[PDB]
Amino acid sequence: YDYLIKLLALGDSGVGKTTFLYRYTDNKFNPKFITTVGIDFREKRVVYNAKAFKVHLQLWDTAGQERFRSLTTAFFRDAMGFLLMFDLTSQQSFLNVRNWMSQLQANAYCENPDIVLIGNKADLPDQREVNERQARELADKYGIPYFETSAATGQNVEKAVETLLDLIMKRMEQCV
Amino acid sequence: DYDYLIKLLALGDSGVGKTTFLYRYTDNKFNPKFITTVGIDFREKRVVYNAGKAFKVHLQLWDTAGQERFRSLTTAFFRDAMGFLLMFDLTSQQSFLNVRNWMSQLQANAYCENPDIVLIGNKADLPDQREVNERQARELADKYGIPYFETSAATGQNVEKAVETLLDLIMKRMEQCVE
């Protein structure tokens, strides 16, 4: 290969991220890195004098936090592009993305991962509840291409990914 | 056979001393666990890209897993919490700046639902590695009107004291909020 290009799928649960990548790729097996996180409690019986109360302390703790940090770090490591995903049938999924993309830190021209905004499930027109001219707006406001895609159909899937490949490669040329 | 069930949480970066602290304090081995797996993964697609000149691009697309189950485990963690044992490691300035940042983005509830907090500088038993200045921590404590204990989980110093204090604030908030 010439270049190895890392991309991330980003978006809320249920938005179709995993179905998206299956559609585009389609490749029997793929590697997973996985770990156990959790919570637990303990108890202690104690007496508190206000008067003289019988109190049950149940104390909680997290487990696996560092192991999960590493995973998130490995995920973001060296990412060149974001497949930025909301649900074309969920106005909440679209609002969350907007909120997220406004608490985004600016970067120098070259460190700045390219972003392509994606409205998924365009093959469920009946359940649609997201204004497509309102989507265009968020795209335009950040100079970001937008696409309406179907992980079902295949509609725009290849084209979205490739459009982001373009951005990355142009940018790479500009920073060599 | 009890009057009140009072839920507390140990918060803080990893390695700070939380799990130890708790065991030090309860001195019993009852400890149910709710554990879930999360992960990440990638896929591959070979693509030809031309600017003109032709480049063989190896595409690798990553994805996460278990986000939603992780969310709701964290929601379960915070649900009906009444007091945070807010902890940092006196030997790790970074552990303390994380606590302070965290404090700065708590959203205060209504008085009666607002969780009580105690700030804890754990690992007081290792003075030769102390990196978090005393006055700095006390100022955080006060910025929030919070008590502050330097504790050793290894040693039991102030562990008893800290929890008791936290409980006492919780109980006070209750007598005021009754009826």
Ligand SMILES: Nc1nc2c(ncn2[C@@H]2O[C@H](COP(=O)(O)OP(=O)(O)O)[C@@H](O)[C@H]2O)c(=O)[nH]1
């Ligand atoms: N009809 C249709 N259903 C979809 C599409 N993408 C995802 N889904 C469904 O929506 C649900 C959530 O999908 P998923 O890929 O797991 O979203 P994720 O949390 O972002 O990984 C699943 O039941 C999918 O079958 C699509 O493009 N068309």
Ligand SMILES: Nc1nc2c(ncn2[C@@H]2O[C@H](COP(=O)(O)OP(=O)(O)O)[C@@H](O)[C@H]2O)c(=O)[nH]1
């Ligand atoms: N010297 C010292 N070491 C401690 C203390 N508390 C915890 N440790 C050690 O720090 C390491 C991480 O502690 P741990 O309880 O797992 O912290 P956690 O990640 O918050 O659960 C362990 O090897 C503990 O023995 C303390 O008060 N003093």
Ligand SMILES: [Mg+2]
């Ligand atoms: Mg998924």
Ligand SMILES: [Mg+2]
């Ligand atoms: Mg622990």
